[PDB]
Amino acid sequence: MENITSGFLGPLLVLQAGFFLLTRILTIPQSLDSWWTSLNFLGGTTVCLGQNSQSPISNHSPTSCPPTCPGYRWMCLRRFIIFLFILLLCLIFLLVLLDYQGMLPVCPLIPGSSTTSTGPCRTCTTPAQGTSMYPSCCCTKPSDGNCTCIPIPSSWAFGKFLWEWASARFSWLSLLVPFVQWFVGLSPTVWLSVIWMMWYWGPSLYSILSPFLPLLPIFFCLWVYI
Amino acid sequence: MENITSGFLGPLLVLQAGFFLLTRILTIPQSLDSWWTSLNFLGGTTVCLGQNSQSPISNHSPTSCPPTCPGYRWMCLRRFIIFLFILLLCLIFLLVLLDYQGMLPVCPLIPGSSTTSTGPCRTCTTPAQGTSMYPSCCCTKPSDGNCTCIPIPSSWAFGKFLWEWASARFSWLSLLVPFVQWFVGLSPTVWLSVIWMMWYWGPSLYSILSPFLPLLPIFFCLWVYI
Amino acid sequence: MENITSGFLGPLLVLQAGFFLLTRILTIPQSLDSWWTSLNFLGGTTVCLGQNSQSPI
Amino acid sequence: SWLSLLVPFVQWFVGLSPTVWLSVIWMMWYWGPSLYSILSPFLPLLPIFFCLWVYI
């Protein structure tokens, strides 16, 4: 062992990493076939309908399958679609993971008057054009020379800037933001109960909603006059 | 009150309009369901799995037994999952669309002596470990230092902080990018020829590589360990 | 401009809304119809038991 | 003389890379009879084009 073990392990580590990557790639097609098929197979079988008569097999070609049996090009197409979906999903997941980051940039520029500096202002900003919006802070104002704006927050990511834009878009949603805020403020043993209630009883809830779904315009007519 | 008639008119108009939109939104889940169904119905034609044999639908099988009949919880759950996936895709699309917009900043950092305009360095000297993504540069240093730093420059790929600034996390990836460009840029009748050949014998070749690909893990570790 | 717009469009929108309201009112009926259809379903059919023999349909 | 003018055309067409003739042949396999069937109506169109260029 000793150094020879380490030298082999380095190559062994590379081989294991590559094999794991290839297995993950293959499984993503297999696993996606699994999920969606069970979606079709929730009360259903897995018999590949692409197994045509000119492909002699009783049922050997009948599970999210084709290899080369009869219809196989469309199975490859399904595999490619699954690969694209998996690529998109993993890209999104990595994007979120690097999005929190603690340190991702989120340099914001919105109208405000919050002050935290050393001996600041007494010249400040006097821009009477372009409304209250602020541009890149090299020196935002048309005539600003000693300008200094606001540094990125140790919270989240550009979601702050979007929320600033989003709050402009919607104000009723801003009011409901406290509602979801206190909803998430509930303890961890809240989401599980919510899921359990939504479990089973949720289809009945959608059923019951279907009645009021026709009645929804009538209900809106009240607030419409309001 | 002829004008007031007009008001109630516009109100009920908005009413029916939102009604339809909903209908369109609900169909969008059903539309995606049909789309993926055809994806599965590449081989298949039409079926709803839950439909029991002892059922008036029987020959009526698609979404006919997704909730009103037979398999309700799982089929409706699949519909809800598809709707959630569609909503997530829509959110991603909106985020991608808002990319090239206004108030779009990357707020990046890189070491250089360039300046957008007349910038006096005044012996700008204060360095630190990890020059990229240094302190806020609000003249946050042992002294002020007469600092001028980067605004949010007007260019595409605002998230270049990862594309190039964090590209140092994998230098070989940058090296492979030159190799990617080397592979690219051939004659116009090169990508088309590759596509035609791949469509011609892609299945046979992929089968040909099957165990060779499994056998590939053996090699290129020993070569390094040599 | 010769664009009448105004009342001519207003009457047309009124007719469309009235048709929609009539459809909704009738649905309310068939809406309760199918909610009581839900009442009898979970394994229940809906055929006309009365309209079985004494009808040429 | 006009043959020489078209000679450079064929010279550069066949002057393409080796992976051009195979694609052309494969197209000929798939299209030849189908192309003949499609262009059969064009024969009546061909007299119309000849008449058009006749005045030109």
Span of the ends, CA to CA of chain A: 81 Å
Order of helices and strands of chain A: HHHHHH
| Gross morphology of chain A | extended
In what range is the share of β-strand residues of chain A? under 5%
The multimeric state of the shown protein is part of a larger assembly
> Largest contact between protein chains?
A-B, 62 and 56 residues
How many strands appear in the DSSP assignment of chain A?
0
Percent range of helical residues of chain A: 40-55%
Count of DSSP helices of chain A?
A: 6
Broad structural category of chain A: mainly alpha
Radius of gyration from the alpha-carbon trace of chain A, in angstroms:
29 Å
PDB class: virus like particle
Keywords: Surface antigen, Subviral particle, virus like particle
Entry title: Cryo-EM structure of Hepatitis B virus surface antigen subviral particle with D2 symmetry
Chains A, B, C, D: Isoform S of Large envelope protein
What does this structure look like?
This is part of a larger assembly, with four copies of chain A. The first copy, chain A, has helices at 3-41, 73-100, 159-169, 172-184, 191-198, 201-225. Chain A has six helices and no strands. In chain A, helix 1 (3-41) crosses helix 2. Chain A has 226 residues and is mainly α. Chain A starts with a helix and ends with a helix. Chain A binds chain C through residues 207, 211, 214-215, 217-218, and chain C through 24, 27-28, 31, 35, 38. Chains A, B: One of its GO terms (biological process) is fusion of virus membrane with host endosome membrane. Chains A, B: Belongs to the orthohepadnavirus major surface antigen family. Chains A, B: Residues 29-79, 196-201 are intravirion.
